[PDB]
Design a protein around this ligand. Structure first.
Ligand code: SF4
Ligand code: SF4
Ligand code: SF4
Ligand code: SF4
Ligand code: SF4
Ligand code: SF4
Ligand code: FES
Ligand code: CA
Ligand code: CL
Lengths: 149, 200, 907, 587
């Protein structure tokens, strides 16, 4: 039995929330604040920041698991599959202040439940690696000074 | 290991101190053996009093699969929302318990009010009752309570409570244990791939 | 006026309006993009499609554009017709075919009109499977960012920037689906009103870079109705905060003042509030030791020294509120209260007030200026001092086309036709300055001359309009010919407008303008007079009155005064730094109450941490004499509990109480307002500027946060997992939370922000107005303190003599910069690039005489100080005059009219 | 009919409208068109008792007051065609004989919030009127004892008023201290009249039966003030409100989508059964007709939770009254629910337009295994009850009531059916494609005693297993989310790759889904009785009013009339026979 015998949790189990990374190793988070507004308890706080290339990312990401109800509304709200509820249930603590997780306690080293999705390969905003016209279903920029009619 | 001294709730003496036993002036191998024996008996004999509130009590009874009197209980598990009309009752039951006593907050509601930041709910039992272990969840899985009990056992095995109420220092020295979040940060961050949410 | 039938229901609308404007004003929802309440109707996006029937028996009508269709009587239209709904959804689908998938990473998300219309049209399924067009972006300067991929070709930016603001650097390039909207080349947008593009563009092509650095979504912003504090126009703004920092300033619709447009100084010049060198707690200087005190300790200790002080004088500021200045006046006594302004500046400000309060001529509101048929600007570089007045003057000049079009019975909303009928025809405009002005493009004539000569022109125009007016001697025949054109233009005008101000640095230019306006009034004309001041509460300090900074310094210099309480004034912009520093060093006690770190603070014994407009509530009076109230946006101590930044009136009121009772009294704002109305009868309207703190909407306080504000239980979790108590507000009717009311139909006039279900973009103001493009449904906020007097002032008979160059002396000519002249805006970091590099301007001939060329550094002495500046050649500047950037750190605005002496090539 | 069910209707065709018009006159009432599905009539306050009596005395008459509550209309902007009112009180009446309901609405002015009591016509109105007074401040003139029922008697202000702050105030130790003292001095400062009770032959002992951790059966913790004559109950007053979490006030602080988590927490043992009535009502406001696969998925999850709740209820009753291990059987259900929802007690899976995800691959295997395990386990459950003479002896003829008592107290579910009234919403008013399933409604023989109630719940398990078998063998193939512009959130695969769907998602998960101004109502057969959601939209992204009628609240008001004259032992058996949770009672 527990804890000697582990418990099978189904792949969709709504437990510890983690931030994930894209197949390229970059954080999938773009700091759009959709998961936070969609959150019914208001236990998510983050601030947008931008790399010199122009990539948006969370300067800070805070989740108060003392208030979290593990509903998965935030994971259902990402347009980037960064925030994901993972099959984990052991998060007991001694002080409530330690139930406030930061990006250091949330950003893992892999893609998580969604294995191959990069919003930056769909976005039209240019970043280091993807220039204008290099996204999916995207034509190359045509200059207004082009000679072709 | 640093300790927090609660000499003689929201406001009370909480001086960070050093292991009182390690201090040479009050260092006795016999006294240390005695402290360990008492801590061992207490951590291996935690009789519980489950105050049933809201939906968390239902998960608790699944884990159960009784000190009906608060007097015979060593641990009060607050499992449910701390409603305004229920708060006086919770305080009275906890105040009808004897030393040593421990409190485990089970559920987002008991932890901080959870999704119920409303006019009829106290935002956390830690607003009126001292808590030792917090269990995040809504409802927390039955197995999560078992982890919390094991965490309490560890904290109890490190306490330095008075060995007798007539002699010695009557101060409750609780160890400043390492946060479980930092303790298991390495394994959690190392996680790379997970099962796709497509299969049972 | 006309009866229309929309979807069966009958409605009474103005026949002079278009169906879009009419139906939107009826509360009916029709999607749109190309049409703007201020830019008129063009009919490009074809989104406002509505089915129109010829009669009540017509069952097969036609799809028409509501924006390009008159709201004529007997009009039968249907917005819910299936074909209309299908076409309106198809228009959105066509716009979505080449639209980038960048919602999460665009700064318009949650405030995007395109997102709102996609949902309103009910288009959630994509059928297009081909490629999406891409465009490379451009650099547009330090304030506006470019993302052409998100464009929908509605043409709003080019119509506003070029047809409304008269800019010349934005345009439409390319053809078919490769249409591009931007500058002809990478560079900074040159229009002083380029910022309005961020709200005009219905997508995210133009965005605010000042916010992008610390970007947050609209639902997470705490907003408060505030008045802009960067100049004297008094535009209504909606400052927004997140995590304890002012994030962005948005336009607050005031159908009487700024309506839908702000200027760059007010929209991007707020970073000074987020400076990390600002005072946050009261600090006392003991020798070389600085001790952080608490409010209670600061009050007790200060009152102890003040109680044993022989004479305590107080210096106010045009930046401070009416309540804050009044609190200092009561603390030190009216006899010991001094306006922190130079004698000359006060004389000019009081003369301007006397003209507006006792001249018998109406002073127009910002929006009313767009209805005059002739404008004369005497000495005021409005574009650089009151930019929004320059935008209004531009719309007034465009009246000739509107009049010409009305004669051909063309609808007022058909802008394209009005522009074609008009061509280059414009209403007469004449501007006078020491050199070139930005309004020279639309001006019939620009008189570049010394301030004295500019005034002589005014007296001359007055004499020509009325011989009873003092005559001027020495006008050359050439100038007289030019004067006659102005006289005939003003004489022929049905609604003339005379605009002057205190920025010229001449009392005569204000007197000349008064004479011209009096002359036109005598000839029975609807003349208007406008006076541009210098700061947010210059007129308010002028009405209150007090001694000059010079007189205050003399008190401290004779030693008669031992204690000086300075209020939000650096003192170096109104007087010599050498004099101020020396005078402040002879005072046993020097207390400074400011929200910014100034130089005088270095030698202050005590510095009280005052709050800025964002963290304070008060009343300011604009150039037109309208008292407007600003409200606190956020609590400064919410995140950092140690912060003790209190309103200046609260600090001073508590000190006065501790001085008289040894007890602290942090009163409510309403009490201070009641004190001002009782003591000063002139400042009595300030009571009606806004409702008190007991005002409620059906029992609910007004809200500052949107209903979807997020992070409530996590924003301060780092400091304490225990959520803090909602900051409470006893001064205003606004709650520092979302538990309040922001309904578009709430019987109020103070709107913190505009949001309506389905309308998350700035287009939501439409639901808060009586008629789209009109006024707030229950009146626009603000009260004019004075009405037009029954009698006027006598003509000023003091005509100055012509300017004469004097070897050695160099008259300092006043050059103002929208970016640099204001004190607080210059402190903002994003303004460093836009602000001009230091310079001195010289007449080409004078430069040749001094044997110096462009770039040559020249040394000159003012207050016993040699200064070096690079030489710039200004042909328009008359000889004997030197040009200096007024307000730029070092060049105090007072230098205007002074003279430089040893001007020579440096080294 | 070709016209969709969500279509706004005035129901003037309803015969009751003609009857009222020919009795009180055409200018005595205003008919409001809504998406509630019931004729809504605005009657004057001086005719409320007259109209009520007429409806009670009609061929096939209205015999049950389903719901009575208030509404603050001081901030409602879309009130076109509604009589002027600052506050209002609604009366939902059900006529089982004509299978039709009517909503009588009375307009009130802020200055005079007084309405004649309706307790004389329908006795169940006592608690509803007390709650309306507690949360709105509307006084019912003639009420026997109008005291607060959900909030402390010392509470200042009416919580459900719009001007009332919704979030929690700063904790005050002092108030807890005083509250604790008042509790310790309650016995000394007890007055029977304050509880509506009267001293009689004297020497009668007033007592407080605490039913919390002393007797905990997952029913919650409340207390009943018992007036005894030895061991016989002369009168009892259940004290409730100890589990009030302001769920209806939260509906006005949460978007239509962000409130779903809260629905599952009204009746925790029901899970998805609690979100069915809410999603269906919001879908009527949105005008969404859900696809057949969603209908079958939403039935399957509901019946899984219906079995889970019954198992626990039957197990607990049998354990206490008689001498059926729910744990094992309940875990197997939780495992399937966890595999599909990712959660056990509070799935929050149902969405406005469908379900959050599609059925996980392998769901069929798990369901088949459970449908091959329960058959035998159920056989054991009934055998016990059928042959447990101890149970039969201690349960039969205890807290017995007939059809009249069930109708006058709003009793629904097994209690109503035990009295012989065959009224199951799943059959009477089919919803979620239940009409496409072959199942029978267990009905009693005229007497609702503790035994008959439990036996019906056992027979319901068998019928639920039948529906679950049809769901497993006839699961339709197609969309798990409706193809409607207001489906929230939109299909994720398209959101991740299409701008139009990304835009729709962004706004629906941020500001919220905009529901046009209207009033909807959906009643469903829950695990403990008829649960309904009366939703009012003012055209925004949040509800203007979320009324949740819960069966447990009415079942606890009938206790005094059904247990009077019995012994405390009988009361404890009755409390068990009533499948109830205090979360459903207090909301
Ligand atoms: S976790 Fe997802 S939803 Fe939240 S801010 Fe990052 S990208 Fe946006
Ligand atoms: S799981 Fe639910 S409560 Fe937790 S952060 Fe996500 S949305 Fe908020
Ligand atoms: S934390 Fe969640 S599951 Fe536990 S009692 Fe509160 S609402 Fe119920
Ligand atoms: S402009 Fe609007 S619709 Fe386009 S990406 Fe930005 S937020 Fe989305
Ligand atoms: S840049 Fe903006 S205003 Fe200009 S055409 Fe594109 S969407 Fe319209
Ligand atoms: S014109 Fe003056 S008041 Fe208006 S926005 Fe510009 S600086 Fe501010
Ligand atoms: S808004 Fe009418 S055509 Fe564009
Ligand atoms: Ca204030
Ligand atoms: Cl001249």
């Amino acid at each position: 039995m527990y804890p000697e015998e582990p418990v099978y949790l189904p792949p969709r189990y709504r437990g510890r929330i983690v931030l994930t990374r894209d197949p390229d190793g970059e954080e999938r988070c773009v700091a759009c604040n959709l998961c936070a507004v969609a959150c019914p308890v208001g236990c998510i706080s983050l601030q947008k920041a931008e790399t010199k290339d122009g990539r948006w990312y969370p300067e800070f990401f805070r989740i108060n698991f003392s208030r979290c109800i593990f509903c998965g509304l935030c994971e259902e709200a990402c347009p980037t599959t960064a925030i994901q509820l993972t099959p984990d249930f052991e998060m007991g603590e001694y002080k409530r202040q330690d139930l406030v997780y930061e990006k250091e306690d949330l950003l893992i080293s892999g893609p998580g439940k969604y294995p191959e999705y990069n919003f930056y390969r769909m976005a039209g905003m240019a970043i280091d690696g993807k220039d204008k016209g290099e996204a999916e279903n995207e034509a190359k920029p045509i200059d207004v000074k082009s000679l072709l009619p | 290991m640093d300790y927090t001294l609660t000499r003689i709730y929201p406001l009370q003496k909480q001086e960070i101190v050093t292991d009182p036993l390690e201090q040479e002036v009050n260092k006795n191998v016999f006294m240390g053996k005695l402290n360990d024996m008492v801590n061992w008996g207490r951590k291996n004999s935690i009789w519980p009093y489950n105050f049933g509130l809201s939906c968390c009590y239902v998960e608790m009874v699944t884990s159960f699969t009784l000190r009906a009197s608060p007097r015979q209980a060593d641990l009060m598990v607050v499992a449910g929302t701390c409603f305004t009309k229920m708060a006086p009752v919770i305080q009275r039951l906890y105040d009808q318990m004897l030393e040593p006593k421990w409190v485990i907050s089970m559920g987002a509601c008991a932890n901080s009010g959870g999704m119920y930041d409303i006019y009829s709910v106290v935002q956390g039992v830690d607003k009126f009752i001292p808590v030792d272990v917090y269990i995040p969840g809504c409802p927390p899985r039955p197995e999560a309570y078992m982890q919390a009990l094991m965490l309490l056992q560890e904290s109890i095995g490190k306490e330095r409570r008075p060995l007798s109420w007539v002699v010695g220092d009557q101060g409750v020295y609780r160890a400043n244990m390492q946060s479980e979040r930092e303790r298991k940060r390495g394994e959690r961050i190392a996680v790379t791939n997970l099962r796709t949410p497509d299969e049972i | 006026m006309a009866t229309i039938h929309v979807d069966g229901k009958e409605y009474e609308v103005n026949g002079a309006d278009n169906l879009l404007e009419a139906c939107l004003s009826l509360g009916l929802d029709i999607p749109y993009f190309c049409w703007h309440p201020a830019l008129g109707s063009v009919g490009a996006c074809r989104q406002c499609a509505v089915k129109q029937y010829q009669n009540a028996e017509d069952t097969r009508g036609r799809l028409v554009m509501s924006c390009m269709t008159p709201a004529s009587d007997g009009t039968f239209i249907s917005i819910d017709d299936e074909e209309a709904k299908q076409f309106r959804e198809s228009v959105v689908e066509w716009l979505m075919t080449n639209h980038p998938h960048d919602c999460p990473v665009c700064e318009e998300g949650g405030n995007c009109h395109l997102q709102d219309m996609t949902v309103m049209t009910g288009h959630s399924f994509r059928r297009y499977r081909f490629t999406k067009r891409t465009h490379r972006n451009q650099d547009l300067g330090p304030f506006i960012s470019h993302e052409m991929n998100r464009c929908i070709a509605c043409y709003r930016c080019v119509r506003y920037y070029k047809d409304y603001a008269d800019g010349t650097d934005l345009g439409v390039y390319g053809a078919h689906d490769n249409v591009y909207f931007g500058r002809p080349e990478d560079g900074t947008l040159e229009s002083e009103f380029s910022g309005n593009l961020v709200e005009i563009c219905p997508t995210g092509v133009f965005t605010d870079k000042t916010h992008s650095e610390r970007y947050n979504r609209k639902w997470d912003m705490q907003f408060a109705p505030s008045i802009c504090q960067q100049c004297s126009i008094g535009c209504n703004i909606s400052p927004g905060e997140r995590y304890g920092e002012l994030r962005r300033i948005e336009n607050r619709y005031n159908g009487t003042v700024n309506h839908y447009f702000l200027c760059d100084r007010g929209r991007f010049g707020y970073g000074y509030v987020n400076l990390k060198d600002r005072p946050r707690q009261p600090v006392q200087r003991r020798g070389d030791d600085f001790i952080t005190l608490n409010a209670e300790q600061a009050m007790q200790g200060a009152a102890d020294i003040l109680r044993q002080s022989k004479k305590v004088i107080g210096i106010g500021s045009p930046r401070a509120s009416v309540e804050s200045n009044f609190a200092l006046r009561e603390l030190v006594g009216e006899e010991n209260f001094y306006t922190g302004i130079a004698h000359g500046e006060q004389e000019r400000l009081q003369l301007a007030l006397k003209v507006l309060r006792e001249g018998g001529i109406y002073t127009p509101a910002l929006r009313e200026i767009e209805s005059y048929d002739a404008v004369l600007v005497l000495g005021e570089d409005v574009t650089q001092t009151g930019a929004r007045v320059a935008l209004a003057v531009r719309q007034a000049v465009k009246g000739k086309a509107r009049e010409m079009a009305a004669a051909q019975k063309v609808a007022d909303w058909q802008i394209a036709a009005i522009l074609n009928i008009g061509q280059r025809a414009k209403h007469p405009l004449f501007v006078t300055n020491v050199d070139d002005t930005r309004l020279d493009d639309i001006a019939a004539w620009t008189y570049r001359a010394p301030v004295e000569d500019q005034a002589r022109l005014g007296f001359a125009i007055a004499h020509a309009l009325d011989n009873s007016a003092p005559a001027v001697d020495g006008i050359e025949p050439e100038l007289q010919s030019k004067i006659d054109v102005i006289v005939q233009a003003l004489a022929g005008a049905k609604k003339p407008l005379i605009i002057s101000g205190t920025n010229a640095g001449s009392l005569e230019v204000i007197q000349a303008a008064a004479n011209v306006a009096k002359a036109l009034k005598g000839r029975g004309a609807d003349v208007g007079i406008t006076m541009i001041a210098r700061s947010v509460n210059s007129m308010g300090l002028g009405i209150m009155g007090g001694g000059s900074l010079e007189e205050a310094l003399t008190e401290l210099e004779t030693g008669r005064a031992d204690a000086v309480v300075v209020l939000e004034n650096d003192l170096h912009r109104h007087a010599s730094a050498i004099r101020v520093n020396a005078a402040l060093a002879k005072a046993p006690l020097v207390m400074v109450v400011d929200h910014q770190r100034t130089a005088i603070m270095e030698n202050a014994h005590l510095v009280l941490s005052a709050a800025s407009f964002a963290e304070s509530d008060g009343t300011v009076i604009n150039n037109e004499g309208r008292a407007q109230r600003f409200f606190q946006v956020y609590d400064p101590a919410y995140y950092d509990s140690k912060t003790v930044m209190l309103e200046s009136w609260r600090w001073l009121h508590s000190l006065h109480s501790t001085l008289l009772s040894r007890e602290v009294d942090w009163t409510q704002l309403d009490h201070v307002i009641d004190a001002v109305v009782a003591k000063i009868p002139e400042l009595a309207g300030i009571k009606d500027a806004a409702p008190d703190a007991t005002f409620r909407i059906r029992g609910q306080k007004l809200a500052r946060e949107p209903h979807r504000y997020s992070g409530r239980t996590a924003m301060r979790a780092n400091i304490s997992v225990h959520e803090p108590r909602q900051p409470q507000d006893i001064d205003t009717m606004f709650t520092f939370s979302m538990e309040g009311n922001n309904q578009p139909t709430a019987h109020r006039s103070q709107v913190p922000f505009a949001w309506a279900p389905g309308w998350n973009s700035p287009q939501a103001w439409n639901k808060f107005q009586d008629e789209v493009g009109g006024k707030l449904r229950f009146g626009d906020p603000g009260v004019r303190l004075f009405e037009t007097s029954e009698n006027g002032l006598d003509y000023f008979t003091s005509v100055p003599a012509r300017f004469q160059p004097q070897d050695g002396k160099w008259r300092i000519a006043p050059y103002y910069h929208l970016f640099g002249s204001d004190e607080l805006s210059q402190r903002a970091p994003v303004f460093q690039s836009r602000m001009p590099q230091p310079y001195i301007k010289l007449n080409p001939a004078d430069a040749a005489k001094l044997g110096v060329n462009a770039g040559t550094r020249v040394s000159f002495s003012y207050d016993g100080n040699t200064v070096t500046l690079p030489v710039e050649i200004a042909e328009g500047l008359t000889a004997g005059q030197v040009g200096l950037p007024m307000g730029m750190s070092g060049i105090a605005p007072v230098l205007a009219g002074a003279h430089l002496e040893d001007l020579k090539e440096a080294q | 009919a070709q016209e969709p069910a969500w279509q706004t209707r005035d129901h003037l065709d309803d015969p009751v409208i003609g009857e009222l018009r020919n009795r009180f006159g055409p200018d005595a009432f205003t008919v409001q068109a809504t998406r509630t599905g019931v004729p809504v009539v605005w009657i004057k306050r001086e005719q409320l008792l007259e109209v009520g009596d007429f409806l009670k005395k009609l061929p096939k008459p209205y015999v049950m007051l389903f719901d009575l509550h208030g509404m603050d209309e001081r901030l409602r902007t879309h009130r076109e065609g509604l009589p002027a009112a600052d506050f209002s009180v609604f009366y939902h009446l059900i006529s089982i004989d004509r299978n039709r309901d009517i909503m009588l609405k009375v307009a009130l002015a802020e200055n005079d919030l007084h309405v004649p009591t309706f307790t004389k016509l329908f006795p169940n109105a006592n608690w509803y009127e007390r709650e309306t007074w507690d949360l709105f401040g509307i006084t019912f003139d003639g009420h026997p004892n109008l005291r607060r029922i959900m909030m402390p008697q010392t509470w200042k202000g009416h919580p459900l008023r719009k001007d009332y702050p919704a979030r929690a105030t700063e904790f005050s130790p002092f108030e807890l201290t005083k509250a604790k003292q008042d509790l310790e001095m309650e016995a000394l400062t007890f007055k029977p009249e304050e509880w509506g009770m009267k001293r009689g032959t004297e020497n009668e002992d007033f007592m407080f039966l605490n039913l919390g951790p002393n007797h905990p059966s997952a029913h919650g913790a409340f207390r009943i003030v018992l007036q005894l004559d030895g061991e016989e109950i002369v009168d009892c007053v259940p004290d409730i409100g100890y589990h009030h979490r302001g769920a209806e006030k939260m509906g006005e602080r949460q978007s239509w989508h962000s409130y779903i988590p809260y629905t599952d927490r009204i009746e925790y043992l029901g899970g998805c059964v609690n979100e069915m009535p809410y999603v269906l009502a919001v879908e009527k406001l949105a005008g969404i007709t859900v696809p057949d696969r969603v209908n079958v998925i939403r039935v399957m999850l509901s019946e899984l939770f219906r079995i889970n709740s019954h198992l626990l209820y039957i197990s607990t009753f049998i354990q206490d009254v008689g001498a059926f291990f729910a744990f094992t059987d309940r875990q197997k259900i939780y495992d399937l629910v966890e595999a599909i929802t990712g959660f056990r007690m509070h799935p929050a899976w149902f969405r406005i337009g469908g379900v959050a995800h599609d059925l996980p691959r392998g769901w069929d295997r798990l369901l088949r295994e459970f449908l091959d395990w329960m058959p035998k386990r159920l056989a054991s459950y009934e055998k016990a009850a059928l042959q447990n003479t101890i149970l039969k002896g201690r349960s039969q003829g205890v807290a017995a009531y007939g059809a009249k008592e069930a109708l006058e107290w709003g009793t629904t579910g097994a209690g109503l059916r035990a009295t012989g009234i065959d009224f199951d919403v799943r059959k009477a008013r089919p919803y979620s494609g239940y009409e496409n399933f072959d199942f029978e409604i267990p009905v009693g023989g005229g007497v609702s005693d503790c035994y008959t109630r439990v036996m019906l719940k056992v027979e319901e398990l068998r019928q639920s297993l039948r529906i679950l078998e049809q769901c497993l063998n006839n699961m339709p193939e197609g969309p798990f989310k409706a193809d409607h512009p207001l489906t929230t959130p939109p299909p994720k695969e398209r959101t991740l790759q299409h701008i139009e769907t990304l835009i729709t998602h962004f706004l629906q998960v941020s500001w919220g889904p905009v529901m046009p101004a209207n009033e909807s109502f959906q009643m469903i057969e829950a695990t403990k009785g008829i649960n309904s959601y009366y939703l009012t939209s003012d055209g925004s992204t949040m509800s203007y009013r979320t009324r949740v009628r819960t069966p447990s609240f009415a079942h606890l008001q009938q206790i005094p009339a059904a247990i009077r004259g019995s012994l405390v032992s009988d009361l404890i058996v009755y409390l068990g026979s009533i499948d109830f949770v205090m979360s459903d009672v207090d909301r």
